[PDB]
Amino acid sequence: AADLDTQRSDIATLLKTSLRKGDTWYLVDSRWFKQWKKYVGFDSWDKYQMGDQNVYPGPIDNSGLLKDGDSLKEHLIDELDYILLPTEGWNKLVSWYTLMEGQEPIARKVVEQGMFVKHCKVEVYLTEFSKADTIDTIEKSTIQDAGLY
Amino acid sequence: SVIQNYNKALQQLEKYKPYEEALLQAEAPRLAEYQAYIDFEMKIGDPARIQLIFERALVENCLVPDLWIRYSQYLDRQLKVKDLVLSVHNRAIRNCPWTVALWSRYLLAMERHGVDHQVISVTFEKALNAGFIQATDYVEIWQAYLDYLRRRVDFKQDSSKELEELRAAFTRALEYLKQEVEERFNESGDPSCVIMQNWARIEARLCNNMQKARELWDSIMTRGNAKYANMWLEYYNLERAHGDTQHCRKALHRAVQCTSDYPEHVCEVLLTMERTEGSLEDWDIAVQKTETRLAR
Structure with missing residues (x-):
């Protein structure tokens, strides 16, 4: 149960973490994180609700991210519906507020992407196998290099 | 003296006689005659x-x-x-709203003269609704507002309301x-992805975020721009x-x-870099x- 100023500082710095292939990041619902931001006084300009129980978010509740019928929900958008936080930030977030009962973290893995300009992004969705796995790797170039909707 | 002024006045009205006869002898709207007088x-x-x-020209050529x-x-x-500046930019867009340049110009004039953000951002919305005949015009006034919104940012501050x-x-x-x-228009208006290019250059040079600029440039290339050498070299x-x-x-x-x-x-270009490092x-x-x- 760390102090407010250290949560803001540890998380802020951790969000700047580079996207290196094979690393494991976790999603966080915008509903919960936008409130965590208010409580820790995360944004210098909107910093008055800091330390108030009117905005204490409680344990991480990615209920709007999981599907009603028992790592789900298609068409979810990054920045609008969720925030990808790295393994250390997710551990810290879990360490301070706890993970809501009957919930598993929405864990995803960073991969090399792009057929023209190679770049890294956390693969939120998959094809039906990963975009970077090969056709030769799939039966036993990459799936993206080949092409399959 | 009363008379000494009267004469000095008249004397300084001879130089315009040709320009006034030119107008008088001409028929409405007297474009070329006003153009010279303006010149x-x-x-x-x-x-x-x-x-x-x-x-005088606007009474016949607004x-x-x-x-x-x-x-x-x-x-x-x-x-x-x-005062005198913004009035004309207001009148310009009121007379010829279909012309994008007038809006773009109005925005800079407003920014130049330090008009509130709330006010400038509202004028921009009016521009979006004026109604231009082609897709490039919509891009042109977006380029305008994004350059304005960019000049508000203090990129010294790592994260800010303005950057957000x-x-x-x-x-x-x-x-x-x-x-x-x-x-x-069944067209984007930005075939070379200038808006995206503009973003990647900011994101890279001013936000230490090459990863976004890469993600962006892969999209640019994906939107039919890999065939061009200049696009590759820009990246x-x-x-x-x-x-x-x-x-x-x-x-x-x-x-x-x-x-x-x-x-x-x-x-x-490749052979040179490998030769250089x-x-x-x-x-x-x-x-x-x-x-x-x-x-081949």
Whole structure:
């Protein structure tokens, strides 16, 4: 149960973490994180609700991210519906507020992407196998290099 | 003296007699005759008289956007009085709303004279609704508002309300072109992805975020821009400054493959960098890769 100023500082710095292939990041619902931001006084300009129980978010509740019928929900958008936080930030977030009962973290893995300009992004969705796995790797170039909707 | 002034006055009205007869003898709207009088008065340099002759021209030629631009540009660059300036930019867009330039110009004039953000951002919305005949115009006024929103940002501050605002605007602009402009013109208006290019350059040079700029440039190339050498080299140059060699290397290798218009140029750019900083086997790999492309 760390102090407010250290949560803001540890998380802020951790969000700047580079996207290196094979690393494991976790999603966080915008509903919960936008409130965590208010409580820790995360944004210098909107910093008055800091330390108030009117905005204490409680344990991480990615209920709007999981599907009603028992790592789900298609068409979810990054920045609008969720925030990808790295393994250390997710551990810290879990360490301070706890993970809501009957919930598993929405864990995803960073991969090399792009057929023209190679770049890294956390693969939120998959094809039906990963975009970077090969056709030769799939039966036993990459799936993206080949092409399959 | 009363008379000494009377004469001095009259004396300083002889120089305009030709210009006044020219107008008088001419029939409405007297465009060429007003144009000369404007040319002449602007050389003299009396602000009161220049304002008057432009005003005289508008009583017969307000329908012409160019006259508004000529009049506005003069007030913008020479008179520099917020009051008298913004009035004409307001009138210009009221008379010729279909003309994008007038809105764009109005926005800079407002920014130049430090008009509140709340006010400037509202004028921009009015522009979006005026109604232009073509897709490029919609891009042109988006470029305007994004350059304005960019000048509000203090990039010294790592994270800020203005930067957050800037990014959201780009995302809105890019969606606006994909939803509204695509549906109305069956075209984006930004074929070379100037708006996206503009963002990647900011994101790289001013936000230490090459990863976004890469993600962006892959989308650019994906929107039919890999065939061009200049597009590859723009990306390359961006990486060379705000990235690293490994990425420059992988990029130029992919560029020799994708380039259609001018592969020889791309090849030579590669061979130069490997000559300037690469290992020998990198220089060799390059030679083979370039040759292989030039074989076809």
